[PDB]
Amino acid sequence: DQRNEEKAQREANKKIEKQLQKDKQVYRATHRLLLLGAGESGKSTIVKQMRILTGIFETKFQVDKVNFHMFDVGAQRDERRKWIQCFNDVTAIIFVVASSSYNMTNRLQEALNLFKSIWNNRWLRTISVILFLNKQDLLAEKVLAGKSKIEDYFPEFARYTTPEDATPEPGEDPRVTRAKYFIRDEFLRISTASGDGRHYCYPHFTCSVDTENIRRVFNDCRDIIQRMHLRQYELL
Amino acid sequence: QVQLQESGGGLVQPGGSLRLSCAASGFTFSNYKMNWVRQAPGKGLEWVSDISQSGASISYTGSVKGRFTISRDNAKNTLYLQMNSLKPEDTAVYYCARCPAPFTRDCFDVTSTTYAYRGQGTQVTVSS
Amino acid sequence: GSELDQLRQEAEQLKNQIRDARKACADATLSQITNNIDPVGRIQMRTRRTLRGHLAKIYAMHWGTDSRLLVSASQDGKLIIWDSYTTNKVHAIPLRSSWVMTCAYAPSGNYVACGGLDNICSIYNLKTREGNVRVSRELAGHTGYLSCCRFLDDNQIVTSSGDTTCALWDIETGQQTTTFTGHTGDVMSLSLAPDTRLFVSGACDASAKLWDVREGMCRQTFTGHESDINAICFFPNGNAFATGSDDATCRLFDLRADQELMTYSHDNIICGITSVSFSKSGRLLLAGYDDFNCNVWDALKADRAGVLAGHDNRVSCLGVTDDGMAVATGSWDSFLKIWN
Amino acid sequence: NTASIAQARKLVEQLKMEANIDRIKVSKAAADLMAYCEAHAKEDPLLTPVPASENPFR
Amino acid sequence: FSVRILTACFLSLLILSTLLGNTLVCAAVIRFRHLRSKVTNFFVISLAVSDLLVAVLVMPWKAVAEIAGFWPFGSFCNIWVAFDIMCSTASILNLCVISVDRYWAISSPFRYERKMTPKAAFILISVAWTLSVLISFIPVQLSWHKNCDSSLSRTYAISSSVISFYIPVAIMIVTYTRIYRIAQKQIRRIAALERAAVHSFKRETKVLKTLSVIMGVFVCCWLPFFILNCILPFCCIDSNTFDVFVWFGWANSSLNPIIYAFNADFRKAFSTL
Ligand SMILES: CC(C)CCC[C@@H](C)[C@H]1CC[C@H]2[C@@H]3CC=C4C[C@@H](O)CC[C@]4(C)[C@H]3CC[C@]12C
Ligand SMILES: NC[C@@H]1O[C@H]([C@]23C[C@H]4C[C@H](C[C@H](C4)C2)C3)Cc2c1ccc(O)c2O
């Protein structure tokens, strides 16, 4: 009548509330990571090297007792203006960009436009972007042997020089690092256009070797949440 | 109906000049971020340029930066794109697309064919 | 010889024919009776119940025929079914996919639909005698995200998609009997008529398409919009429907008129509409915009009857009961404000 | 180019199907609208203020 | 009744401002659940409720005693002093727990979200409040201090200020100097991208200014009071400076709602109500 069946309903609601408050810890402790790209940009090599373990949509892992969630979108259509709005609770948008796919199509400019749209998005305005300049080994030989040159799709590369924060490696040419940093700053040129402080970009150079790329994501999301809490507390 | 008719195009000599006039009817042209995107025969679409709701944040691609010029006119609801110093690579089908979100700076019209707001395009052919 | 250009020209000529035929029957407008019907006024709607148990952002919701239980899904892989009368989570299904975009409560109150970027629709059953809820049916035939879905009955359910192919799935066989091909942009939402014989779908091509579920063809099309139709809602009379898009204009189309009736736009609104739902009489129109506030508009006076406080984030989902008792607005702040 | 030809064929077929339909006047459309409103006005709990006793949410 | 009316009005305005700000924070928390849902705001609302409790039974009575020079409730003077100590040490412990929670969220945010659950926030708030209880209500029942003239003991006052202010203020200082060592690193990493995209310390001063407004205004109203409170039973000072130096710390309670509610969410919650 008034409480014969409503009491069991209230008990079930209390059990559901207990389950939800137990799931809240493992959910908020879990930092999702949206992974996307302009197309064949090496995201497969990124998701393949994830903890060394109906198609391939989402893969999960955990490092330093911090479970992440990497959702690949390598099956949705090219139109990203609608479903990407679902990624406003995500902690970081891992943008796996192939810095050598500009030859085949000018996919680098398409990735630049996608990054600009993600940055100026009304819902992704508070979400950082983990820029992944994938396919670095295929870029060095391209810019060295003249098979693929940045200046064909970028006029500013002739008016650009390597900054003071270069990271040289054994067996690398200064022109390769110059082109890599030029692409990085072209990605960074949109990151400072708005400058709302709610989100920042994080460039990285991967796919050169098959080492643990999850460390460059963990130590990146660390600073991501650091600056998020700093902007939240206004200590940034 | 959101229609965009891009008049112009044809045979072009390498290094000449060309003007496409995109008349967009069916919406408030003074409120969206219109953009021109090219597609080469045999390759995917290439984002060429975009313009703000008023004309402040004008941006071009690296292939046409300094050569092309995009200008929006709200008194006539038109988008004028001027190509200068044509190259044998600039030959392509040009589409005057519109990204749906207004009062914004993001656009997701760099996708492939079968787009919502995208005209049939003009086959800008570069002669010899 | 020259087939593509002549076909495009024929399509443009037929579109102009549709346009001037709509104009031929447009000898008047709904504003020509503004002196006959009286307005409603600034009605203050206060939050009666608040379902503060969601974890992630509440993306989609749908009421039931009993106007008591309401479903709501979030991106944390959870889908909670609340009793709006006592604010009690009757059910909580952990979805196999975290990101979900659609919700649908069956008219019988037994089946519940979810789905999202996982390209599958997970139909669950509630009245099972086995106790806990499990996956009753899985629908995997779409190559695009499931933006919205609506249950016709306990047997069939029509789901939108991201690849311009709305599918009428059958729970018995789990296979698409028909397909509503013809859209240009990915379908963002869809609504069902009270008679359930025909259903409308608002896509991102700025052209809401009204199809029929018996033959599977395109009955009507409406291209009077300017941006992605984020949400759609059939009028309770079954002859009209409102469409909320990103252009900050809610457009009311009619099936028999095959054109637009009113544009509930405003200069003080620069954000787009995210959800649209009619009241019991359809005179009121609940529109969840992107300005963190839900607006009650008048379907006749063509003005915003009022604005609601509460949500600080974007109000994504909105649902009015079958009897129009209490409208529930779920925003991206894991909150469900049940107005009245 | 055959895919574009098929898409244009489906589009012109849909346009032909849209052409041969019975379109009523927009005046009668608005009349049906306001008639349904005035028929369900006094029964709508959202339109008219519903008392707290008859409302299951107050 | 001619010159004391000015300071009377000043202290009444001060206590009314404390009451208004704290009631505003409490109303924004109990009505808007977008604030009492995050773990980091549990300590903020604990500081706010302590700031309300110090404005109902601590500062109004001191003001009504200072305006006329006399003091009512002669038998209740001991429990009133106990309430003052409790409220002050609770405010200081809430400041310290907010500081250490911010330090944990800035240094190791993943471990912060994994360990500092709402249950852990409740544990920390309860630990702070029980420390306040054992440091205020326990000594007054045994008369550990030596009209009801204000004079503590030379052995208990120093220990109470250490376990109540000195250790909390030391934790606050070390956390804000370890946060600054991380905030400056984040600012340098931001500059390394900003200056490179346009190819210094312009943003490095905003963090310094906010750390100032949240820490120096706290250590310039409580510490100037405690440096005299610990030396009072050892001797120095007079009755005309200590009573206003404690009002400085009580006005730090007026400035606190502006400190930990300057964020956008709290700003909107205050503007709407
Ligand atoms: C004179 C003394 C004994 C009275 C004060 C009692 C203390 C323990 C009470 C008074 C107000 C209370 C707070 C009021 C509101 C909240 C918000 C809630 O989300 C968590 C608990 C919390 C933070 C309470 C903790 C306990 C609290 C601080
Ligand atoms: N507001 C600060 C609080 O005040 C009391 C005290 C005690 C005596 C009677 C009253 C007037 C003087 C002298 C101050 C109240 C002392 C005290 C406080 C806070 C932390 C402490 O560790 C501590 O010792």
Task: Give the nearest partner residue to A57 out of C78, C118, C290, using CB atoms.
Answer: C118
- Kind of pairing, strands B69-73 and B78-84? antiparallel
Which pair of tokens denotes residue C30?
């709904």
Element (H, E) at C82: strand C78-83
Any idea what DSSP says for residue B118?
B
Nearest Cα residue to atom 21 of ligand 2 = E161
Q: Is C92 helix (H, G, I), strand (E, B) or coil?
A: strand
- The encoded tokens of residue D47 equal 């339109």
Kindly report the nearest CA distance between residue C90 and chain A, in angstroms. 6
What is the E74 CA–ligand 2 centroid distance (Å)? 18
C-alpha to C-alpha distance for C227 and B97, rounded to whole angstroms: 12
CB A214 within 8 A of CB A49: yes
SS3 A54: coil
CB distance C57–A88 less than 8 Å? Answer: yes
Quick one: which of C147, C182, C189, C148 has its CA closest to C165?
Answer: C182
- B83 occurs within a structural domain: yes
Chains that touch A (3 or more CB pairs under 8 A): B, C, E
Q: Cβ contacts (< 8 Å) between B26 and chain C: which residues?
A: 206, 223, 226
CA distance D10 to chain C (A): 7
How far apart CA A165 and CA A160 sit, in angstroms, is 14
Domain that holds residue A83: 35-233
Task: Count Cβ atoms within 10 A of the Cβ of residue E219 and give its class: 0-12 exposed, 13-18 middle, 19 or more buried.
Answer: middle
Of residues E210, E152, E218, the one with CA closest to residue E184: E210
Chain D interface test: which of C283, C322, C336 (most D C-beta within 10 Å): C283
- Alpha-carbon distance A181 to A201, whole Å? 14
Residue D54: closest C-alpha in chain C = C325
Helices E4-31 + E59-68 axis angle, to 10: 170
Helix axes E4-31, E264-272, angle to 10 degrees: 100
* Both structure tokens of E221: 């109203």
Cβ neighbours of C15 in D, within 8 Å: 15
Integer Cα distance of B35 and B38 in angstroms? 10
Q: How far is B53 from chain C (nearest CA, A)?
A: 13
- Non-local (6+) Cβ contacts of C39 within 8 A are C298, C300, C301, C303, C305
In chain A, alpha helices (H): 6-28, 43-48, 107-119, 137-145, 174-194, 215-233
Please name the residue whose Cα sits nearest to atom 25 of ligand 1: E46
User: Per 3-state DSSP, what percentage of chain A is helix, strand, and coil (rounded to 5)?
Assistant: 45, 15, 40
DSSP H helical ranges for chain C: 4-24
Q: Is the dihedral of CA A16, A21, A23, A28 positive or negative?
A: positive
Q: Hey, which of E49, E101, E138 would you mutate to test ligand 1's pocket, going by the most ligand atoms within 8 Å of its Cβ?
A: E49
Class of residue C38 by CB neighbours under 10 A (exposed 0-12, middle 13-18, buried 19+): exposed
Residue B47, chain A, CB below 8 Å: the answer is yes
Number of Cα atoms under 13 Å in the Cβ half of residue C84:
31
Which residues of E have a CB under 8 Å from any CB of C?
A: 33-34, 37, 265, 268, 272
Distance, CA E80 to ligand 2 centroid (Å)?
11
Q: Which residues of C touch D26 (CB under 8 A)?
A: 25-30, 254, 257, 259, 261
E169 Cβ contact list (under 8 Å, min separation 6): E92, E96, E219, E222, E223
Q: CATH number of the domain that A87 lies in? A: 3.40.50.300
Q: How far is the CA of E23 from the centre of ligand 2 (A)?
A: 24
Instruction: Find the radius of gyration of the CA atoms of chain C.
Output: 20
Structure tokens at E65: 């005693």
| Pocket lining: E53 vs ligand 1, CB cutoff 6 Å | yes
Domain parsing of chain E, residue ranges? 1-273
Nearest to A203 by CA among E197, C212, E209, C198: E197
Q: Which amino acid is at B68?
A: F
User: Residue C222: helix, strand or coil by DSSP?
Assistant: strand
Q: How far is the CA of E40 from the centre of ligand 1 (A)?
A: 15
Answer whether C105's CB lies under 8 Å from C150's CB.
Answer: no
Residue E56 Cβ < 6 Å to ligand 1: no
N- to C-terminal Cα separation, chain E:
37
Q: Does A133 fall in a domain?
A: yes
Q: Which residues contact E128 (CB under 8 A, 6 or more apart)?
A: E46, E90, E93, E94, E96, E97
Three-state DSSP at A129 gives: strand
Residue A123 belongs to some domain of the structure: yes
Could you tell me how many helices (H) and strands (E) chain A has, helices first? 6, 6
Interface of A with E in 164-183 (CB under 8 A): 165, 181
Find, among C86, C26, C45, C41, the residue nearest to C286 by Cα: C45
To the nearest whole angstrom, how far is the Cα of A105 from the nearest Cα of chain E? Answer: 25
> Looking at the DSSP assignment, which residues form a beta bridge with residue C199?
C192, C211
Atom 16 of ligand 2: nearest residue by CA position = E85
Closest CA to E172 of E95, E105, E116: E95
Please enumerate in sequence order all residues whose Cβ is within 8 A of that of E142, keeping only pairs 6 or more positions apart, or say none.
Answer: none
Nearest chain B residue to A157 by CA distance is: B62
Nearest to A78 among B65, B101, B112 (CB): B112
Q: Which residues contact C256 (CB under 8 A, 6 or more apart)?
A: C239, D22, D23, D24, D28, D29
Hunting for tokens 């045979």 — which residue is that?
B11
The angle, 0 to 180 degrees and rounded to 10, between the axes of the packed helices E77-107 and E167-197 is 30
> Exposed, middle or buried by CB within 10 Å (0-12, 13-18, 19+), for C135?
middle
Q: Are C7 and C265 in contact (CB under 8 A)?
A: no
User: What's the CA gap between B5 and B25, in Å, rounded?
Assistant: 8
How far is ligand 1, taken at its centre, from the CA of residue E126, in Å? 9
The answer to whether position A19 is within a domain reads no
Whether E128 lines ligand 1, by a CB cut-off of 6 Å, is no
Tokens of A230: 């700093």
CA–CA separation, B92 and C132 (whole Å): 59
CA A95 vs CA A34, A116, A204, A206: distances in Å: 8, 12, 10, 12
Could you tell me which chain E residue has the CA closest to the CA of C311? E34
**CATH number of the domain where residue B57 is located:** 2.60.40.10
State whether the beta carbon of E89 lies less than 6 angstroms from ligand 1: no
Q: Using the CB atoms, write b or e for E92-131: b if 16+ within 10 Å.
A: bbbbbbbbbbbbbbbbbbbebbbebbbebbeebbeebbeb
Single out the residue of A171, A111, A164, A183 nearest to residue A141, CA to CA. A171
Kindly give the distance from the C-alpha atom of residue E18 to the centroid of ligand 1, in angstroms, as a whole number.
17
Closest CA to C150 of C107, C179, C117, C185: C107
C-alpha–C-alpha distance, residues E6 and D42, integer Å: 63
What's the CA dihedral at A63, A66, A67, A68 to 10 degrees? -90
Number of neighbouring beta carbons within 10 Å of residue C53: 21
In Å, how far are A123, A130, E152, E222, E231 from E237, measured between CA atoms? Answer: 59, 59, 14, 16, 9
Q: What angle do CA C114, A54, A115 make, to 5 degrees?
A: 80
**Nearest partner of B92 among B18, B2, B25, B3, judged by Cα:** B18
Distance CA C147, CA C142 (A): 11
Phi, psi of E46 (to 5 degrees): -65, -45
Instruction: List the residue whose alpha carbon is closest to atom 24 of ligand 1.
Output: E46
Nearest in space to C69 (alpha carbons), one of B13, A1, A13: A13
Contact list in E for residue C333 (CB cut-off 8 A) is: 34
Q: How many helices (H) and strands (E) does chain C have?
A: 1, 28
Contacts of B88 (CB under 8 A, 6+ apart): B14, B126
Specified resolution (Å): 3.5
C-B interface (Cβ pairs under 8 Å ≥ 3): yes
For B:35-64, CB contacts with C below 8 A are: none
> Encoding tokens for residue C263?
């544009």
| Tokens encoding E109 | 């945010």
Tokens 């479970």 map to which residue?
A: A67
**Is A22 inside any structural domain?**
no
Angle at C313 between CA C289 and CA A117, to 5 degrees: 80
Q: Name the interface residues of C facing E (CB cutoff 8 Å).
A: 50, 52, 309, 312, 333-335
Q: Most distant CA pair in chain C: distance in Å? A: 69
**Residue of the CA atom closest to atom 9 of ligand 1:** E49
Q: Do chains D and E touch (3 or more CB pairs under 8 A)?
A: no
Query: What is the CA D26 to chain-centroid distance, rounded?
Result: 12
**Residue C139 sits in a domain of what CATH number?**
2.130.10.10
* Smallest Cα distance from C168 to chain B, Å: 23
CA C223 to CA C226: how far, in whole Å?
8
Q: Whose structure tokens read 């086995």? A: C130
Task: Tell me how many domains chain B contains.
Answer: 1
Q: Minimal Cα–Cα distance from C114 to chain B, Å?
A: 26
> Coil, strand, or helix at residue C67?
coil
Residue whose C-alpha is closest to residue B48's, from B85, B4, B17, B93: B93
- On whether any CB of chain B is under 8 Å from the CB of C272, the answer is yes
Domain, as residue range, for C189: 3-338
Q: Report helix, strand or coil for E74.
A: coil
B70 found inside a domain: yes
d(CA A87, CA A32): 9
| Minimum-distance CB partner of A117 among B44, B63, B107 | B107
Please state, in angstroms and as integers, the Cα–Cα distance from residue A234 to each residue in A120, E28, E177, E260, E264, following that order. 22, 20, 16, 10, 10
Tell whether D52 lies on the interface with C, counting CB pairs under 8 A.
no
Question: What are C131's two structure tokens?
Answer: 């106790």
CB A186 within 8 A of CB A112: yes
Q: Give the bridge partners for B59, in sequence order.
A: B50
Alpha carbon of C339: minimum distance to chain D alpha carbons (Å): 9
Would an 8 Å CB–CB cutoff place A222 in contact with chain E?
A: yes
Are the C-beta atoms of C330 and C288 separated by less than 8 Å? no
What percentage of chain B's residues is helix, strand, coil (to nearest 5)?
0, 45, 55
Residue whose Cα lies nearest atom 10 of ligand 1: it is: E49
Q: How far apart are CA B123 and CA B115, in angstroms?
A: 18
C-chain residues near D18 (CB < 8 A): 14, 18, 218, 220-221, 258
CA distance D30 to C261: 7
Both tokens assigned to A224: 């991501």
Q: Is the dihedral of CA E103, E107, E108, E110 positive or negative?
A: positive
Q: Return the structure tokens found at E163.
A: 């376990």
> How many folded domains does chain C comprise?
1
